[PDB]
Design a protein around this ligand. Sequence first.
Ligand SMILES: NC(=O)c1ccc[n+]([C@@H]2O[C@H](COP(=O)([O-])OP(=O)(O)OC[C@H]3O[C@@H](n4cnc5c(N)ncnc54)[C@H](OP(=O)(O)O)[C@@H]3O)[C@@H](O)[C@H]2O)c1
Ligand SMILES: NC(=O)c1ccc[n+]([C@@H]2O[C@H](COP(=O)([O-])OP(=O)(O)OC[C@H]3O[C@@H](n4cnc5c(N)ncnc54)[C@H](OP(=O)(O)O)[C@@H]3O)[C@@H](O)[C@H]2O)c1
Lengths: 333, 333
Amino acid sequence: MKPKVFITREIPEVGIKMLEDEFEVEVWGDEKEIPREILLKKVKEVDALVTMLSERIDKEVFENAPKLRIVANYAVGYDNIDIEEATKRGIYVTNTPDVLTDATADLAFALLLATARHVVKGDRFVRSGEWKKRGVAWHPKWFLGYDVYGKTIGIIGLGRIGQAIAKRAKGFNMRILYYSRTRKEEVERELNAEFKPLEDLLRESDFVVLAVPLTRETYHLINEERLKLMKKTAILINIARGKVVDTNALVKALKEGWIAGAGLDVFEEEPYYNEELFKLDNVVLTPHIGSASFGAREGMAELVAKNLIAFKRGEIPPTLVNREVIKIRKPGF
Amino acid sequence: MKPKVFITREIPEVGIKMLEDEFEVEVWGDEKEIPREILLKKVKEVDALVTMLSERIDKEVFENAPKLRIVANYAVGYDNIDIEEATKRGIYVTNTPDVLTDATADLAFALLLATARHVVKGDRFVRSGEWKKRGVAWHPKWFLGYDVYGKTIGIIGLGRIGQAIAKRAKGFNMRILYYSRTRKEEVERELNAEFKPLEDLLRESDFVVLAVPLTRETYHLINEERLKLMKKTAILINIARGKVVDTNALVKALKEGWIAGAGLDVFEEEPYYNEELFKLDNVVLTPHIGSASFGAREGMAELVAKNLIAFKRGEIPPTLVNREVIKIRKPGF
Ligand SMILES: NC(=O)c1ccc[n+]([C@@H]2O[C@H](COP(=O)([O-])OP(=O)(O)OC[C@H]3O[C@@H](n4cnc5c(N)ncnc54)[C@H](OP(=O)(O)O)[C@@H]3O)[C@@H](O)[C@H]2O)c1
Ligand SMILES: NC(=O)c1ccc[n+]([C@@H]2O[C@H](COP(=O)([O-])OP(=O)(O)OC[C@H]3O[C@@H](n4cnc5c(N)ncnc54)[C@H](OP(=O)(O)O)[C@@H]3O)[C@@H](O)[C@H]2O)c1
């Protein structure tokens, strides 16, 4: 167990214990994210790294990590890693797909329902004592929300999570529409999902759900132009990446009533603060807790360890993101 | 259109307009529920009544309503009406089943997911600016919640809404258990639901959902004894009636960690206020908004009108609750 690995956050002990028997492990345990200056210091002697989205693994990090051969992201997304640069350097990059699919799909529906039915607003009304203080038991128009069952859901990005969201949508007998980079006729057949050009999906959906990774092509995909295409009664749900949505445009759309509401788990900056957005009572916000379930956190921890241990043994990591690297340099330290 | 009807709340205009062409309609439009003294005054000359749960239609009301022949509840529950007394007097009682089934089942799942994943707590954390102010982007243990997909759901009361909840549970690939007064083998076959004695359902469920009406038999069904039977990681969801749950016992169970959390849409008194309950961050509360969807409210309004108009025409109301009354007195004014 001579290989050295530095883990940038206190992930589940199950994964740390698996790594301890194969690597010399070090784990960042401060309350705040590891400072850039300290990260550059820590990567100087490591053979492997386990990172969070908060760490920008760019060329500067690689230039300061001469022994680094594998970076395991404790996340399924990898927009925080310069994949092209890594591959060029023969550095393997892994992520945690599948093990967090159901937790994120569950949260996506939690936001869809909470936003559609004003659960957060209702909770505040009761909990604050306003309900009792005002002395009125019920009104027909109070917290009047949108039906979900039988309605149309438009999923943008029909990947691992997009499909999981579609499976749940069938439990609500919804009409499923989707727009994605790759068409999946088999999924279309099995779930009765129907492919639609982005423009038509936006016009026909009662609920628009974002499940695409952040790339040059998805950056601000949902802009002012597209928000205007959506139904005024439609709700936008984002569990993908904040930068996939033009926040200023979204806030404008909500204030002007172009759409009915939005449920967001991701933002353009994290932590995030936007006074105008936070004033709106037709939005539901969560701090990137998509994979925050006991099962997901554990699976992610075990998967990160599996990838590093497989690599140490000269095997191809199970969830390698840049497979071209294999031809550049064979696995191992 | 000589029959007179008094409606105790401003329900959707679609229903009021349907009634206007067949009855002389009067609609209570004050901010607060109609006072008892005024209700007794108003029922003196009416032939029909459209009531909300806030109105207790007991013997005292009947004794003061000599012309009353039909009471249409704008609700599916009717624990606010003395059905036995009504029948005896030849008074027809109708409710609004089915038209609000999907809205309530949707809200039930909204609470299940919101409670399991700490959506309300997360929203407060972001919205209050605490997330940004503290400057920490993410922690592995923050808002750590329970997986829903593939977990076990125990539905108590497998009726219209209980079954709707089970259909949604299949979208989450859940193991479905149920305890109800009547066994439905066909539903067991179609949804893979499994009947279980109440005690076994409580011990085996990860999520316990209440969907039974309030009766002498369901009053405080979930008491201290039964809360102790549930898993310490289980969550209780109540969209039925508040009195089906011993609130003091529930608060004790939550404070002591007997169960993981609870999502409640109904309370023992409405409006409700309970300082100890409202302090708990593992509960989600909504003000009886189960049927608060545009579609449900409209369907309910049309159904109430359909029942009264059918009755006027000497027909049996579509959703008559006390069918024994037909033999007591034929329909009509
Ligand atoms: N909020 C959270 O906590 C959380 C949790 C997990 C994931 N996420 C986010 O969700 C993203 C997706 O996760 P996942 O595992 O489903 O990823 P995945 O299976 O790759 O799915 C991504 C989907 O987006 C499609 N796509 C990519 N670029 C597109 C474009 N330009 N236009 C239309 N569709 C495009 C992909 O198409 P292809 O078939 O062509 O590749 C695929 O269908 C992650 O990258 C991450 O950003 C967030
Ligand atoms: N929160 C809201 O806004 C909202 C909205 C709608 C309804 N509700 C509440 O939900 C209740 C149920 O509505 P629904 O239309 O599903 O009613 P429903 O079809 O009668 O369903 C009630 C279910 O409870 C069962 N049940 C009755 N007594 C029982 C007992 N002692 N033990 C076990 N099971 C028992 C019934 O069995 P059987 O087959 O034997 O009759 C039936 O399966 C309503 O009465 C109301 O109180 C609340």
